[PDB]
Specification:
Hect, E3 ligase catalytic fold; transferase/ligase; E3 ligase; 13% strand; homodimer; antiviral activity; Probable E3 ubiquitin-protein ligase HERC6 (chain B)
C-alpha cells in the first residue's frame, strides 16, 4: 500500500510538468484523502495500487472546470482485417 | 441485450483519427465480430472495470488516438489548472462523490 510509489509512477503529457503548481496541489490534496476516499477516487478513475499509472493532461490540449477521466485506445494504423483481428485476440490476454 | 451500437457512437477520435478513417472501420467490423465474452474481456483490458452489465457498456466511452505496433490503452486524468488548495480538495470530493 505505498502511495509514494503510486505518485512516482505518474506520467505527464501536454500542459503539465511534475513541478507544475497545480500538480503539486493535486498530490497534497490526494495524500490528505483517507484510505477509503483514495479507493473511491481510484474507482472513479478506473486493489492491493502500486503498479497503476495515471497520466495527467491539461484540459485545453484535447479536443474544463471539473476533473474527468478518459480511457484512451492507442490503435496502430492497421491496414488488414486479419492483422486487426489478430491484434484484438492478443489484447484479449 | 447489449447496446454495442450506442457504445460505438459514444466514441471520440483524437490525434490523427476520425470516424471515417479506414482503420477505424476495420476496428469496429472486427469488434462487432467477437463474442460477448470477448467483447467484455476486451473491455476489461481497456479499463479494468468489472461493471460490464448492459447499462454499463451503454454509457461507456472510448477515445481513439494513433501511436509501437501493439494495441495499448491508458487512463488519462484531465485536470483543470486549479489555483488553490481549497479548490483542489473540493474538486476531488466532487469527483469521488458521483
Amino acid at each position: 500500500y505505498d502511495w509514494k510509489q503510486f505518485e512516482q509512477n505518474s506520467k505527464y503529457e501536454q500542459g503539465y510538468q511534475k513541478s507544475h503548481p497545480t500538480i503539486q496541489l493535486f498530490w497534497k490534496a490526494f495524500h490528505k484523502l483517507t484510505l477509503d476516499e483514495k479507493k473511491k477516487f481510484l474507482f472513479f478513475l478506473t486493489l492491493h495500487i502500486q503498479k497503476m499509472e495515471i497520466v495527467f493532461r491539461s484540459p485545453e490540449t484535447f479536443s474544463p472546470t471539473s476533473i474527468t477521466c478518459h480511457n484512451i485506445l492507442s490503435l496502430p494504423k492497421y491496414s488488414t482485417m486479419e492483422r486487426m483481428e489478430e491484434a484484438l485476440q492478443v489484447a484479449i490476454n
